Design a protein around this nucleic acid. Structure first.
Lengths: 51, 94, 103, 200
RNA sequence: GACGGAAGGGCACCACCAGGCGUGGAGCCUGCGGCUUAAUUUGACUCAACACGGGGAAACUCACCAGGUCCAGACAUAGGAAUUGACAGAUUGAUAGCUCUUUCUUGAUUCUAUGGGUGGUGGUGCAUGGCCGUUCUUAGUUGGUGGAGUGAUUUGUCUGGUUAAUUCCGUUAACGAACGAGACCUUAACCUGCUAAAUAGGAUCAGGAACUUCGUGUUCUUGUAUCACUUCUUAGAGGGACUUUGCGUGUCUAACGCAAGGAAGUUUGAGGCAAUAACAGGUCUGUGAUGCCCUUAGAUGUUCUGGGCUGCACGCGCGCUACACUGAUGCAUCCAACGAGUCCUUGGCCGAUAGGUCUAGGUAAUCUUGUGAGUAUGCAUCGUGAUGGGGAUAGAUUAUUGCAAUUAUUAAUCUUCAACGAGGAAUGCCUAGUAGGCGCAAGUCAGCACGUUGCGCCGAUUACGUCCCUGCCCUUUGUA
């Protein structure tokens, strides 16, 4: 009637939980993390970069 | 969903907050009513937009999810509306 | 009691957390002297994400190479289930997912 | 169920979503950090802190909030999650404490010179090996101008950086704009140093 | 300080040398100018803008444009006693009661106005935070006390030798320190040793099939079948290179070169980490990081239908496939590693193909999978013809994802058969499992890779130097 399309798939369906942003959405292993959001909190999750 | 929440379902928000003393609501408007209390999710956001701006409840954000605490003057208000016996729910009690 | 067979999974992020558990629970078995085999070290499932460092497009296109590591390890036994509950319940570690399984 | 790679992601992000929440609620409390100890059907959760008075409050008011607040959100059973406050011995060395301490000195309204030496004096007296405290953003000026304070030696590089330093960052909000505030604290088996014995 | 088309040193394949393979030429993909348009949202413009914003946009995303909704405007003061849901027509793209010609309902949630909030991918990165790039892959940078100077400042931080290095030995109005460098961390190389494995195997001992029947003669296959093992497989503990030894080269001090030995002798190879100063670099369009301004119901909030970012007289930038016979085509042979899945897909039938249909294993060293990958190899036809090299451009048909495929999302089947015969001036990348070529996997993803990030396979030519070009670092020197 109003205020809803079919919203099931594509970038419009889903957003970053931390900052509410669709762009740059890391969905590997079911993160649902926007990249700007993901890199700074990556050490606190577990991810430690080397080589 | 949409429109003003019934006045029975106003007390459905308050009587949950009267017993437990916590109520957290997801920021999203189109999201399903919050797990726990069977109402629209917008109506929980509207009633605690209403509550915070007359003090009583202590709002605290992070993470879209809005983690409310209920103060000493807050438990006076609900009891009056609720009609609950005085000293009914101390947070000091376990 | 009955002749059973138990093979306990161990997983964590740290190496140092499991090397406590592998040393402790075999010595905890050797209190009672059960039929222990040594800890079978499976291959390491390294998880990987590569994002860009910059928020916007500017500069040279540089990249992080983030990594987790996961360490599946298996203590083998042949013993009934009532005996093992004493060994596992004492000496639980911080942030180490453990699951006991018959067969 | 879920697979083990997805499980450490789901359990890992729970740590991060927990920690930034417990930063903001325990801001004026001035906490150190968090940790979790999962056991089967009794998920314990250990809050460290500089002071224990605010976090318990009155007969465990704000403990029994934060037991309830977690299990409402993430979908646990009642009394499955349960919080225990804890005191850190040698409390000066934690960096997120001092950044949050230096926040409320500036936010109340002191000069930036006088406050930052006082925070730098405590961590030096507490028995840190060395430290620095930066304050970026505009200050007595319309153009930005980052003041820097430093005493005692502080390494920048290698894997020995990440262990032996502890490092923290916060915002703080003023009439004219936002200031930055860094803190960085070197702690007390190093790579570089070699202590040789005497034979007699 | 910076600059010099001044001197003396030491350095880099983002610089030449010796070369290798390319781009620039052709068509096509894709980004940026412009030109166009109702709208073709918008940032960034030498290296450090231009397959970049993880930017492969059908709607969503969406900022743009032509229209239509909802208030999701807290609360304070105040009038009034209010606001809502909607059939069938009207009207509208619209089965939006939006607004209506009408008349049933809603029950104090809200309306009405004034103050004030609230929200935004509105503006400002020349108000800022945080983060990243660049100066700068180089070796550089501070203060304590003392010395010199009226002082800015200087000395330490150095003639010289040595080093990847302000790294060392040494020289000394300096002495003793800190960060950077180094160390460190992760990974790749070799251990018939250590410690093990019905979620990796091998060897055994008994059975089955086939050829041989030569005989325990070669090749497949079988089991919580075993007794017992760890060479490959896996990974904890460790060992291993110190330039050890020989001969040169040096105040024989620091250390170089060459040869032998060794798995390995450029710091053993390859990365992560990264100082002090900064630049009016970029990002308010990653954010509940934010000051100020804008506007706030006839909206820049929000959301729904449709279009647009893909629009083409023409310039410029990264890539792909080409021009053939070391080849193309058709048959046969047999070999990888990184992943990744609550979707990945074996097995059997139907179908030229795509694909479908009925069972079926998998929370994964167990199942897909030992992912029978392609350059490669063997045997045939083609014959230098733009030909069968080349596969753009174009008509017609059959499936697949989706709620919807037209400006055609792809994948197939048949046709249609252009330019291009090694690329003008300019100029990029690169020293050994490297270049180049050949595939595969993951990220974005309902569907779509000519893109990026990793992974292996086949595997060369030519240097082991240099300051000529283009930059860099340190001294003495000149400066308006």
């Amino acid at each position: 009637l109003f205020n809803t399309r079919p919203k099931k798939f594509g970038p419009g369906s889903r957003q970053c939980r931390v900052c509410f942003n669709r762009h740059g959405m890391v969905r590997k292993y079911g993160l649902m993390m926007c990249r700007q959001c993901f890199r700074e909190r990556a050490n606190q999750i577990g991810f430690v970069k080397y080589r | 969903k949409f429109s003003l929440i019934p006045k029975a379902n106003r007390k459905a928000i308050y009587e949950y907050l009267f017993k437990e003393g916590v109520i957290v609501v997801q920021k999203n408007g189109k999201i399903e009513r919050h797990p726990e209390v069977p109402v629209p999710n917008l109506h929980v956001m509207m009633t605690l937009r209403s509550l915070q701006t007359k003090k009583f409840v202590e709002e605290k954000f992070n993470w879209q999810h809005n983690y409310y605490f209920l103060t000493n003057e807050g438990i006076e208000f609900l009891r009056t509306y609720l009609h609950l016996p005085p000293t009914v729910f101390p947070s000091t009690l376990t | 009691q009955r002749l059973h067979r138990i093979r306990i999974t161990l997983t964590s992020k740290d190496l140092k957390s499991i090397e406590r558990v592998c040393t402790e629970l075999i010595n905890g078995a050797k209190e009672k002297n059960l039929q222990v085999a040594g800890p079978v070290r499976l291959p390491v499932k390294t998880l990987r994400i590569t994002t860009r460092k910059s928020p916007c497009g500017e500069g040279t296109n540089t990249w992080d190479r983030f990594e987790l590591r996961i360490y599946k390890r298996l203590i083998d036994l042949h013993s009934p289930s009532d005996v093992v509950k004493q060994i596992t319940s004492i000496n639980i570690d911080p942030g180490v997912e453990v699951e006991v399984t018959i067969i | 169920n879920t697979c083990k790679k997805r499980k450490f992601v789901k359990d890992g992000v729970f740590q991060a979503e927990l920690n930034e929440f417990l930063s903001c609620t325990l801001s004026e409390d001035g906490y150190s950090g968090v940790e979790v100890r999962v056991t089967p059907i009794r998920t314990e959760i250990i809050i460290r802190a500089t002071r224990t008075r605010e976090v318990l409050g009155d007969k465990g008011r704000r403990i029994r909030e934060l037991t309830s607040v977690v299990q409402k959100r993430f979908g646990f059973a009642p009394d499955s999650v349960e919080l225990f406050a804890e005191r850190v011995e040698n409390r000066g060395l934690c960096a997120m404490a001092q950044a949050e301490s230096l926040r409320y000195k500036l936010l109340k309204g002191l000069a930036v010179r006088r406050a930052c030496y006082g925070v730098l004096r405590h961590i030096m007296e507490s028995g840190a090996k060395g430290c620095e405290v930066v304050v970026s953003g505009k200050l007595r000026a319309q153009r930005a101008k980052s003041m820097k304070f430093k005493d005692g030696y502080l390494i920048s590089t290698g894997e020995p950086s990440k262990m032996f330093v502890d490092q923290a960052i916060r915002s703080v909000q003023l009439r004219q704009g936002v200031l930055g505030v860094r803190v960085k604290i070197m702690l007390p088996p190093l790579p570089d140093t070699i202590i040789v014995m005497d034979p007699k």
